[PDB]
Amino acid sequence: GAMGSMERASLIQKAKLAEQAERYEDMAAFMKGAVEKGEELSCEERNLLSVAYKNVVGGQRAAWRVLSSIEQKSNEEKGPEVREYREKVETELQGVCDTVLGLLDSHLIKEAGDAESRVFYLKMKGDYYRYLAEVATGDDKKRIIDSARSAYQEAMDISKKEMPPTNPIRLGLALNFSVFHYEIANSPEEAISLAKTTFDEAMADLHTLSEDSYKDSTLIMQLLRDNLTLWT
C-alpha cells in the first residue's frame, strides 16, 4: 500500500524510532505497512503494532470523552458545533479501529498458530471492538458488544489450555476482558469474579518464575488489584 515501496526491516526500524520520538501516528503507519508485507510478526513486532495503535486510539478516546462530556452538558443552545465535532472525532476513531480489525482479519489471526500469537491478536480484536462499543449507539451496538465478547472468549479459552496462569498475555487478556465486563457489558460481578480468580491463580504460580518473569506477572497483578479496589 502506502508503505508498499519500503523494506519490511526499514518499516520496523522506523516504527521503533517513531516510538522514541513519540510520533505514534507515524508508528502505526509504519507497522500497518509492515503487517501488509504479509509475513507473520515476531513477539517484539506484535508489541510495536499494539503500542502504536493503542496510543493513537487512546488519544482519540480521551478526546471523544472530553467532547461527549461537553455535549451532554449542553443538552443554552450552542448550535450544532459540539455534536458535529464529537461526530468527527468519533468517525476518525471508528476508522482507526476498523483499520486494526482489518489487519487482524487480513490475515494476522488466521496465520497465527502458536498460542501466544493467536491469543495476542484475539485480545487485540476484543479491545478494538470494545473501543467501537464505547461510542456505539445505533442498530449495531449489541452486535459490536458481542463481537468483542466472542474474541475475548476465544482468547480466554486458548490461554487457559495453553499458557500458565502467570503468563503476561494471559493476565493482560483477563484484565482487559474484566474491563469489558464492567464498563461495556454491564456485568460488574463477572468483572470482579474474573479479576479475583485471575489474581489468585497467578499468585499461586509466582513460585515457578524467575526474577524477570515475576516482575512482569506482579505488575499486571497490581493492575488487577487496582481495578478490584476501584470496583469494591
Partner: peptide, 9 residues
C-alpha cells in the same frame, strides 16, 4: 478502571 498499557511503564 485500567486496561493493559502498551509498555511496562
Amino acid at each position: 478502571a485500567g486496561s493493559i498499557p502498551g509498555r511496562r511503564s
